[PDB]
A and B are shown apart, each in its own frame.
Chain A
Amino acid sequence: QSFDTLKRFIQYDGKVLRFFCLWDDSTSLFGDRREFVLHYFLCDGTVEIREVLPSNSGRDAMSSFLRRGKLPKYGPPGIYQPGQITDRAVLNVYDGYLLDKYQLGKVEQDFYTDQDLSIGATINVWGRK
């Protein structure tokens, strides 16, 4: 499979897609309806989020709300039991590693895509809709 980055970095470097965000925590006991901003960087399809504070709210100053990273598609996923997060696999140590002809350290983790997100639809952001 492909472990290549350079072509996409040369093609889609400074292009991001920004969506504003509304989130109704009014169904909860004390939350207000919130306004956020969701940036989506096309160099590596990675998402960041930030809060937009009103004129009269007692919230502290936040330059972010989460990290610029990949967002999982379904839920706060269990990616625990460490060692499975490595993308390439190995066969032995001979450091110098030899690629195993079978692939055993592979878990199907799905991410958000520019094909996935769109205007006027609802998604799942770390257990929040």
Chain B
Amino acid sequence: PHYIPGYTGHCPLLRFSMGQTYGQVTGQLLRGPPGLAWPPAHRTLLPPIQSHERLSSSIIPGYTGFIPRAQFIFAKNCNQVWAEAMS
């Protein structure tokens, strides 16, 4: 768990730490922080793994009507919007 060398961002205690390669300093800093608290729910560095009625079957992709809570779901296929709204 480290950062790649060209990275242009903020790493705590980086300016005060010295005398190593950049990736080695970032790995050692991300491993632990005696001075402060590192956040628990983080989302930059992630593990690499390869990319009554009305169920999801009871309709067609041209069906007209009201499906509850399915006007706020976006970027998905119509059956997928209906599936993750109903279930």
Contact, chains A and B (beta carbon distance below 8 A): no
Which residues of A are in contact with B by a Cβ distance under 8 Å?
A: none
